[PDB]
């Protein structure tokens, strides 16, 4: 604990809940780029940015 280089690991007794979201309603677009090979790119985003 006296040496700063080592990290300080902590363990909780009561869980802290966390809510994460990606509000952007993206879409998947599979554009064939090779024989038997398919690349997946993001399409039009529906809704608010």
């Amino acid at each position: 604990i006296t040496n700063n280089a080592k990290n300080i690991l902590v363990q909780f007794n009561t869980p802290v809940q966390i809510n994460c979201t990606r509000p952007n309603n993206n879409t998947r677009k599979s554009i064939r780029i090779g024989p038997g090979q398919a690349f997946y790119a993001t399409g039009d985003i529906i809704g608010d940015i």
Partner: protein
Amino acid sequence: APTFVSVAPGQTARITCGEESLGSRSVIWYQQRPGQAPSLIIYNNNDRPSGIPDRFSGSPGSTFGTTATLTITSVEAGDEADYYCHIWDSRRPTNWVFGEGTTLIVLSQPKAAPSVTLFPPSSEELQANKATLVCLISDFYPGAVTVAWKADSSPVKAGVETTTPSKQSNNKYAASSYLSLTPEQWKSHKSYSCQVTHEGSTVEKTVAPT
């Protein structure tokens, strides 16, 4: 530019205005009676201001991919006017020009066929090096304008000016169409004509030099 929608008295109206929605919108609808000032109907979609009947309803701005819509059920005679929409789209920048308005018109009597009369340019005008064809259209209802100038086979797009239709104390409206040409052009083509269509019914009258 204008868009017309015919609605029988006491029936539902469908009004389209604005582009496709890309984000959450806040649509504004306005009422511009003929000659009067634009009056507000709907702000923030279905929500309305004091003194407005419930027959006017706005489509919600929460959905995406659709166009705004002002719904009028059992239209009374007073509701007929020009309606503009002001789009506040989250994805789109600020709009300073309203959308192309929709002209709602109650039928308010039976459809009338246009009465057309075409006159050749005056002989006196040839001396001044000015030639003008006059296509008169009257006794027509509703006030829908369709200008079509055909010089023999092929038409002429430029050099034509037409006014807005207006009623003259009758169901009919007043439409007058003009065309500025040169004296050497009147003797060029064999015969001219101005075709007038109304609600899908075309009327054509020709003219020939002497």
